[PDB]
Amino acid sequence: KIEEGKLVIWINGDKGYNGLAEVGKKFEKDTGIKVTVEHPDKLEEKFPQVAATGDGPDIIFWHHDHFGGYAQSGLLAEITPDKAFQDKLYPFTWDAVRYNGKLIAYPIAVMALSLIYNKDLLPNPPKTWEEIPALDKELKAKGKSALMFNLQEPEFTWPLIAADGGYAFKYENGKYDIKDVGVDNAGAKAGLTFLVDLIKNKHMNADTDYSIAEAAFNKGETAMTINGPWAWSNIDTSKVNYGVTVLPTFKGQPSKPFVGVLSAGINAASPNKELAKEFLENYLLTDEGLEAVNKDKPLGAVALKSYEEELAKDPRIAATMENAQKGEIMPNIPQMSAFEYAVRTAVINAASGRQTVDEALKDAQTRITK
Ligand code: NI
Ligand code: NI
């Protein structure tokens, strides 16, 4: 069972856990309670296993989409932030931690893809997807290319596909309608066709993956790429002069990237729910708290309005939030895995020539709503 009298926190090893610990030291000073921060391997898989037996950490940190399954099994406590506290965070982040109408976690950070460009090759990045073909025809003339990004995963290609109307699951009144899927509608078809045409016209290659795109951009071979905050440090070392900005529009509409929200959940079995709330709300979710975590390992954009406004002085972070507000929160239902596999296959088949855009999307649609 979970020990009372202390707080045990689990967070991924790729996060600023040393920073969380510093926030833990300030909490300990005022309450006399010690905070332990651990980062187990395969945390997302271990938590549900131990929490099921009434054990595990008092607090679990992980992107939100995984919390829907946890809440389904009753592994998370409903949090109780009052109106005042809720207004301190961006409205859309609360939607990311909602399941069956209940708030089951505290939003911490906001992740989303942005357009990254080489300022030396492209002082003024394109505002639309449509102008990319001609831009590439200009650059290839100089031995360069306009754009290169990972085409293997839906995470990177769905922003364009969704722009004109595609969607995973219809969301209304805080709930996804698993039978209302927007994969083979007119909008998704327009987006995927534009993507496939880029490949057919030799502006992109169907085989381009993460490593390839990153290397090409970091070597100054391509004017643009699409990636998240996790990729910035590698570009910093490459010395390429770059900027991060809003994703291009399609047919005048916003590219919609999926939005991931680093969230903090409270174990339903924890006898320390009062200590966890206090720590999360009044120590971590403060300018001083997020700053501590962010200085250890960058969080990217954050859900706390006050601190986000400060972090947004960095255009890269402002861009991240802008794309996030224009995107769609990653659904936290189990059917999302079906969408990801189905759409991953559809894009690969259309990009290769195995299937036409219309047939590829029709198959995925039917596969998802099965
Ligand atoms: Ni570890
Ligand atoms: Ni995940």
Please tell me the distance from the alpha carbon of residue 283 to that of residue 289, in angstroms, as a whole number: 6
66: CA distance to ligand 2 center in Å? 6
Indicate the burial class of 142 (C-beta count within 10 angstroms; 0-12, 13-18, 19 or more).
Answer: exposed
Resolution (A): 2.0
162: CA distance to ligand 2 center in Å? 20
Sheet holding 242-245, edge to edge: 145-147, 222-227, 114-118, 242-245
* Domain that includes residue 76, residue range: 5-111+260-331
Please tell me the distance from the alpha carbon of residue 344 to that of residue 154, in angstroms, as a whole number: 6
Coil vs helix vs strand at 114? strand
Is 166 found in the same domain as 42? no
366: Cα separation from own chain's centroid: 26
What was the experiment behind these coordinates? Answer: X-ray
> And the tokens for 253?
């509409």
Is 203 found in the same domain as 141? yes
Nearest ligand by distance to the CA of 43:
1
Spell out the residues 6+ positions from residue 108 whose beta carbon is closer than 8 angstroms to its own. Answer: 61, 261, 262, 263, 264, 284, 285, 290, 299, 302, 303
The count of structural domains within the chain is 2
Neighbours of 183 (CB within 10 A): 29
Residue type, 246: V
37: CA distance to ligand 1 center in Å? 10
Q: After which residues is the chain broken (C to N over 2.5 A)?
A: none
Please tell me the distance from the alpha carbon of residue 360 to that of residue 42, in angstroms, as a whole number: 34
Is 160 found in the same domain as 64? no
Which helix (H) or strand (E) segment holds residue 338: the answer is helix 336-352
Please tell me the distance from the alpha carbon of residue 196 to that of residue 290, in angstroms, as a whole number: 41
DSSP 8-class letter at 330:
P
Cα separations in angstroms, 302 against 31, 311, 322, 364: 26, 8, 12, 34
Q: Are 360 and 192 in contact (CB under 8 A)?
A: yes
Q: Specify the CATH number for the domain of residue 361.
A: 3.40.190.10
239: CA distance to ligand 1 center in Å? 31
Nearest ligand by distance to the CA of 69:
2
Spell out the residues 6+ positions from residue 34 whose beta carbon is closer than 8 angstroms to its own. Answer: 6, 7, 24, 28
Is 250 found in the same domain as 266? no
209: CA distance to ligand 2 center in Å? 19
Strand runs labelled E in 246-315: 258-266, 301-302
Spell out the residues 6+ positions from residue 151 whose beta carbon is closer than 8 angstroms to its own. Answer: 157, 195, 199, 204, 205, 206, 207, 208, 209, 347, 351
Q: What is the pairing mode between strands 258-266 and 106-111?
A: antiparallel
Is 351 found in the same domain as 210? yes
Is 39 found in the same domain as 91? yes
Is 351 found in the same domain as 243? yes
Please tell me the distance from the alpha carbon of residue 32 to that of residue 336, in angstroms, as a whole number: 43
Please tell me the distance from the alpha carbon of residue 216 to that of residue 207, in angstroms, as a whole number: 14
Is 156 found in the same domain as 94? no
Supply the Cα-derived Rg of the chain in whole angstroms. 21
Q: Are 207 and 347 in contact (CB under 8 A)?
A: no
Is 271 found in the same domain as 247? no
Task: Determine phi and psi for 262, rounding to 5 degrees.
Answer: -55, 120
362: CA distance to ligand 1 center in Å? 43
24: CA distance to ligand 1 center in Å? 18
Give one DSSP letter per residue of 159-189, joined into a string: HHHHHTT-BSSEEETTEEETT--BSSSHHHH
Q: CB pairs under 8 A, 24+ apart, for 210-214? A: 210/150, 210/152, 212/148, 213/148, 213/149, 213/150
Nearest ligand by distance to the CA of 337:
2
Is 78 found in the same domain as 215? no
Is 91 found in the same domain as 117? no
Q: How many CA atoms lie within 13 A of 42 on its CB side?
A: 5
Is 136 found in the same domain as 124? yes
Could you tell me which of 17, 19, 339, 11 has the C-alpha nearest to residue 184?
Answer: 339
